[PDB]
């Protein structure tokens, strides 16, 4: 009925049994039992080697229906060879994506779309495959991380998390929607909850995206009966976060509708079998019992031929018209804090984000996208619109601890910084030093050594210093250049002696009265001339004696001069006493 | 031609069927179906509980080949007993099975593999012979046993360092010491892989590319050659266990590469010969040479008829490292701990903490890095640039783990619990930074109360910005000094100077005092003024000098010039005393 | 009393018919009206052509002086003071011009 021909490296294979599993969400896998005729040399004569040199060789499986002429063709590679025994060989392998699932590695992609990511992943591998790279989501993804995943694992998780069809069609690896009797039919229906919603907070845009359950696209009659039965069972809305980061409202809408349609496809399905090789993967089949059971899209199919040559066929189907293919073979990774190095902080969005380089980018170079830096205090207020709290953005070259929001490697952030070897002198003796230092040398330091330099210090590199001496209970303010005090009122109160000392000159400018009240003696010593000028009357009152001793001449000038003594006057001179006047002298 | 003797606690066991499984990577496991003859009392006459007393009893299994005279010997302990109705089934396995039933926390600080293994085996009550000769004799700073049984912890730790760790049928070996059917298998595997590890304590980056094979057969070479062009891009991965040197990561990457390579081609085989033993080398020949293989696991089966069969698997001989097997890496999550010291001998700001599981019985960890909101270095600072507040002993900290590794702990931050915190202020008013002495940098946001900023210590010195009053207060209990080249004291309205005892103006060169209004001086005692040069005084108004006591003037030449009249008034005599003459013109 | 008698003050005796001029020698210290020695109560004796010839038949006292000035044991003479003479009678010597000549200066040449 069906003739199956297998060609290994272009040569027709003599097989006894063959199994071939194909799926739109999992590797195709073939297992072929090769016959070795007694006349030809046996497997032991050829050897384990020579036989093992067929690893990676192409395998072509062509299944032909003689009655209808329809052909199913599959091209794959060999990944396993078993030589056991009169002695035969087991050729195991499948779609070339099998050899894409063996290289777990760490990598990242910055500001790239799905097309470029898939092209780069497939270019870095040595497996040869025709590729139809047509993803629907054409937007640039800010950051994607490959976290200990194989090439196939990373690509599968990334593409299926975006709703993109990603499967081997038997000849080419297809990304994106392709836009394309029975013997053991079996229809099943299950109770599934369609009352679910997804959420995602975007801090770069400060938006809370919310998506509720969408509308069915591909639904059979059993699907509708199952949906009707399940509607009363789940009256509460199940809220879940997005497994994949969402950067826009439309992005979350697409994520949510992909999830809803996966659920609705699992609402009811078909499990059929036949002996017809024209039933292909990813195609539509209208199933009839001997009448219509619904149109179903084939998601997986197992073509097989036993020893007698009796071809058989068995397949799974989802309601035809489902926009998204089943989620299978894909597992989202879980990421844990990693040490990294800051490479930049010139954030274009001006949000305090930094760009770091992980430890797996140390040798060959590279950097991440912009990630938030966690702060002990951060926020805003009515008086402080922006940048409230602790704002210390890391400098390039800083060793940092990078945590991951939720478990997602695509959601990294800086949890903090580390003092390892190249930037730490450690704690002082018994700690005792707690300092905030910037890159210019601005120091805000507390010294707790009560037997040493106990106190507080605010200083700069140039020499400005402001010191609390707790042991001595002193305060010092030092400016190498000018120091200026400005206030409406200045109050310099000293409980003991007050000292003022200028190196050059003390200049005292008073715009109004000058009150000086001395409770004790006054001692003025002037090393040069004293010049005094009064714009009005000068009054002096002395309760004791007045003694003025002048070494050189004394001169007094006035308009009228009255010298009245309550006791006696004595004018003593050594040369002369002249009382010349222009009007005469009178004794009265 | 194989006879099998089974002895339970030294007594010959009458067994209907036997299964035995030995492996170099997991537990040995046996299943013996003990027969109960009709003439002897049944299992119900004896009672399952009485039969159960055989839990933990030694079992000896001797399979001897009659023609060759070779013997295989196994010594295990019974772990499970099933009395079925009747007969008894004993599932004991190797003694390491009883070492895999006690998950617990533990830590080993600055120990080598020998000491950790000896400690684990001494703490347990399973008595078995041990050949503890692990190849890696260097000490390890920190090893954490995290929710792990004794056997599981030992397995993952010894297979992380590439040591052989398996029961040989009579001894727990730690460290390197005619077929019926056959099945040789080849796989495509990637040898283009590399391992990386950053050491912050030594500030180094360790990179290890894939090594070179030792135990390669023809199938291994064929598979390697076939898979060579399939993986042109190297896959970088981090080490599962921490590495403290370049040679350490070389060993780790070598073990990984050899484990990966040994699976390129492997063998499975069947036999009826008791000379193939676990961990031995056999030459596989077609009943023409398939290669030399080390037996990694082997099964010994006796059916009801008494016929002994054998099924085993083998890795390419010459492979240095046995399969990963039972070993599994644990995943750690943030814990709470108490800082016990911060006297880091390497002077890297690291602290030593004690976890909550090591609290009742005591104990510490190794030194761990402390996470900081700001940390790094610059050209001018070059060390301790950022936020350096090292935790003090007794602090309650949250301990995170780098990656998932319990052996890579670090301090994430400190916690304010019942004893640490006293609470926020009115509407969360006070934001403070305090040290252990009492130094306080405080911001008070209560605009209706003590709104403002404060820098203070516990001895009295204070610097207070009174934001409500717009004032600035600087208080020193003893002395306040202001040093600068130029000092300007600019008062918008008032400048008040007050001194309790003395005000001492020590002017360097010149004194300028410009008063825009009145000058009022009140001197409470004597005034003493000295001038070393001239003394000029200009008065645009009236000059009054009223002395309550005697007035004395001395000079060389005295001249009084009155632009109007001069008056000499006295209540007593006026003395005009001179030497060369008195002229009253 | 208004003025003070100084050296070379014009004076007459009640008998001698010649207006002689006073001579001051007890004072070399107290000058006034320029450089004219002041006449005191110690200007006694031949302190004066002593009025030409005597005519009593055809200095010991200086009453009338100023008592508020003491110039070395004596008091200054005044325009109303009268002197005696041992050869004559009490209060015989008088004064008309007491040797004080006011020379006018720049201030006194503006008030005219």
């Amino acid at each position: 009925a069906v003739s199956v021909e297998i060609k290994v490296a272009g040569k027709v294979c003599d097989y006894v049994t063959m199994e071939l599993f194909q799926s739109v969400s999992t590797h195709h896998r073939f297992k072929i039992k090769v016959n070795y005729r007694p006349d030809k040399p046996s497997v032991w004569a050829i050897g384990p080697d020579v036989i093992f040199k067929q690893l990676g060789e192409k395998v072509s499986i062509i299944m032909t229906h003689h009655e209808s002429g329809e052909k199913t063709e599959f091209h794959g590679l060999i990944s396993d060879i078993h030589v056991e025994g009169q002695g035969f060989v087991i050729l195991e392998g499948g779609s070339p994506t099998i050899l894409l699932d063996r290289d777990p590695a760490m990598d990242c992609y910055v500001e790239q779309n799905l097309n470029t990511i898939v092209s780069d992943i497939l270019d870095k591998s040595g497996v040869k495959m025709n590729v139809t790279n047509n993803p629907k989501h054409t937007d640039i993804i800010p950051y994607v991380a490959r976290y200990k995943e194989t090439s196939y694992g990373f690509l599968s998780r990334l593409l299926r998390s975006y709703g993109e069809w990603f499967y081997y069609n038997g000849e080419t690896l297809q990304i994106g929607n392709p836009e394309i009797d029975l013997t053991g039919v079996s229809i099943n229906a299950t109770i599934r909850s369609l009352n679910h919603s997804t959420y995602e907070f975007d801090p770069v845009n400060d938006k809370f995206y919310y998506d509720y359950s969408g509308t069915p696209k591909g639904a059979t009659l059993g699907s509708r009966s199952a949906e009707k039965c399940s509607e009363p069972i789940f009256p509460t809305e199940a809220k879940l976060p997005s497994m994949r980061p969402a950067y826009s409202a439309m992005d979350l809408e697409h994520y949510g509708d992909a999830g809803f349609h996966r659920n609705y496809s699992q609402l009811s399905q078909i499990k059929a079998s036949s002996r017809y090789c024209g039933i292909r993967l990813g195609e539509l089949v209208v199933t009839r019992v001997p009448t219509d059971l619904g149109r179903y899209r084939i998601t997986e199919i197992t073509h097989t031929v036993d020893g007698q040559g009796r071809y058989s066929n068995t397949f799974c189907g989802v309601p035809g018209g489902t926009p998204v293919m089943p989620w299978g073979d894909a597992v989202m990774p879980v990421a844990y804090p990693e040490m990294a190095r800051v490479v930049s902080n010139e954030d274009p969005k001006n949000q305090g984000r930094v760009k770091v380089q992980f430890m797996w980018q140390e040798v060959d170079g590279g950097e991440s996208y912009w990630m938030r830096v966690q702060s002990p205090d951060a926020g805003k207020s009515d008086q402080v619109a922006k940048n409230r709290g602790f704002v210390f953005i890391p400098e390039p070259g800083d060793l940092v601890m990078v945590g991951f929001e939720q478990g997602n490697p695509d959601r990294p952030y800086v949890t903090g910084s580390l003092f390892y070897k190249a930037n730490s002198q450690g704690a002082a003796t018994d700690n005792t030093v707690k300092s905030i230092r910037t890159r210019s040398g601005h120091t805000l330091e507390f010294n707790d050594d009560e037997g040493g330099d106990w106190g507080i210090t605010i200083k700069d590199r140039n020499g400005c210093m402001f010191h609390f001496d707790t042991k001595g209970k002193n305060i010092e303010i030092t400016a190498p250049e000018t120091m200026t005090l400005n206030a409406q009122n200045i109050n310099i109160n000293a409980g003991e002696q007050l000292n003022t000392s200028s190196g050059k000159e003390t200049v005292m400018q008073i715009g109004t009265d000058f009150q000086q009240d001395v409770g004790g003696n006054a001692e003025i010593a002037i090393g040069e001339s004293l010049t005094e000028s009064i714009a009005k009357d000068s009054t002096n009152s002395i309760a004791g004696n007045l003694s003025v001793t002048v070494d050189e001449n004394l001169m007094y000038d006035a308009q009228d001069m009255t010298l009245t003594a309550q006791g006696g006057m004595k004018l003593l001179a050594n040369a002369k006493i002249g009382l010349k006047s222009s009007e005469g002298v009178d004794i009265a | 031609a194989v006879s099998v003797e089974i002895k339970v606690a030294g007594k010959v066991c009458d067994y209907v069927t036997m299964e035995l499984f030995q492996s170099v990577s997991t537990h040995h496991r046996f299943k013996i179906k003990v027969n109960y003859r009709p003439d002897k009392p049944s299992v119900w006459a004896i009672g399952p509980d009485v039969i159960f007393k055989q839990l933990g009893e030694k079992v000896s299994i001797i399979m001897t080949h009659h023609e060759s005279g070779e013997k295989t010997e196994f010594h295990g302990l019974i772990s499970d007993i099933h009395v079925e109705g009747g007969f008894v089934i004993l599932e004991g396995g190797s003694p390491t099975i009883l070492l895999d039933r006690d998950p617990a926390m533990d830590c080993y600080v600055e120990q080598n593999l020998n000491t950790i293994v000896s400690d684990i085996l001494d703490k347990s009550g399973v008595k078995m012979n041990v050949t503890n000769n692990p190849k890696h004799t260097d000490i390890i700073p920190y090893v954490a046993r995290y929710k792990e049984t004794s056997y599981g912890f030992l397995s993952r730790l010894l297979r992380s360092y590439g040591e052989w760790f398996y029961y040989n049928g009579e001894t727990l070996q730690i460290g390197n010491p005619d077929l019926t059917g056959v099945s040789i298998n080849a796989t495509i595997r990637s040898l283009n892989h590399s391992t990386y590890e950053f050491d912050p304590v030594n500030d180094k980056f360790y990179y290890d590319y894939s090594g070179t094979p030792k135990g390669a057969t023809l199938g291994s070479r064929s598979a390697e050659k076939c898979s060579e062009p399939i993986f042109p891009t190297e896959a970088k991965l981090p080490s599962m266990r921490p590495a403290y040197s370049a040679m350490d990561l070389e060993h780790y990457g070598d073990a990984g590469f050899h484990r990966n390579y040994s699976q390129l081609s492997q063998i499975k085989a069947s036999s009826r010969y008791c000379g193939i033993r676990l961990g031995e080398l056999v030459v596989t020949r077609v009943p023409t040479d398939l290669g030399r293989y080390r037996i990694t696991e082997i099964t010994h089966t006796v059916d009801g008829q008494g016929r002994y069969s054998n099924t085993f698997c083998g890795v390419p001989g010459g492979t240095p490292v046995m399969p990963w097997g039972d070993a599994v890496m644990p995943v750690a999550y943030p814990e709470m701990a108490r800082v016990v010291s911060n006297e880091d001998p390497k002077n890297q700001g690291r602290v030593k903490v004690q976890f909550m599981w090591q609290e009742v019985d005591g104990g510490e960890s190794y030194w761990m890095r402390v996470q900081s909101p700001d940390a790094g270095k610059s050209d001018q600072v070059a060390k301790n640039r950022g936020f350096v507040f090292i935790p003090e002993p007794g602090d309650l900290v949250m301990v995170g783990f780098e990656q998932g590794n319990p052996d890579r702990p670090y301090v994430t931050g400190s916690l304010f619990y019942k004893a640490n915190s006293q609470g926020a202020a009115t509407d969360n008013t006070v934001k403070s930074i305090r040290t252990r002495s009492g130094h306080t940098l405080e911001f008070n946001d209560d605009e209706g109360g003590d709104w403002g900023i404060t820098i203070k210590d516990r001895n009295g010195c204070m610097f207070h910005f009174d934001t409500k009053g717009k004032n600035i207060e600087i208080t020193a209990p003893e002395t306040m000094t202001l040093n600068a080249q130029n000092i300007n004291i600019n008062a918008g309205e008032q400048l008040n100077t007050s001194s309790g005892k003395e005000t001492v103006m020590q002017i360097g060169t010149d004194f300028q005092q410009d008063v825009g209004g009145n000058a009022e001086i009140a001197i409470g005692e004597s005034l003493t003024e000295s001038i070393a040069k001239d003394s000029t005084n200009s008065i645009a108004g009236n000059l009054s000098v009223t002395v309550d006591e005697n007035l004395m003037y001395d000079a060389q030449d005295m001249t009084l010039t009155a632009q109007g009249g001069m008056k000499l008034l006295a209540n007593a005599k006026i003395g005009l005393k001179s030497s060369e003459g008195v002229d009253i013109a | 009393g208004k003025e003070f008698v100084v050296d070379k003050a014009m004076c007459m005796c009640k008998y001698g018919a010649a207006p002689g001029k006073l001579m001051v020698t007890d004072n070399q210290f107290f000058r006034l009206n320029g450089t004219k020695l002041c006449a005191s109560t110690m200007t006694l004796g031949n302190v004066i052509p002593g009025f030409g010839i005597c005519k009593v038949n055809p200095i010991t006292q200086w009453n009338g002086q100023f008592s508020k000035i003491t110039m070395m044991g004596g008091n200054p003479l005044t325009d109303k003071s009268k002197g005696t003479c041992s050869c004559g009678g009490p209060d015989c010597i008088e004064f008309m011009q007491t040797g004080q000549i006011p020379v006018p200066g720049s201030k006194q040449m503006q008030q005219a």
Binding site: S581, I587 | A585 | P104, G105, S106
Partner: peptide, 10 residues
């Protein structure tokens, strides 16, 4: 010049 003046009684 100021000349000379008279010392008299007020």
């Amino acid at each position: 010049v100021n000349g000379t003046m008279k010392f008299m009684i007020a």
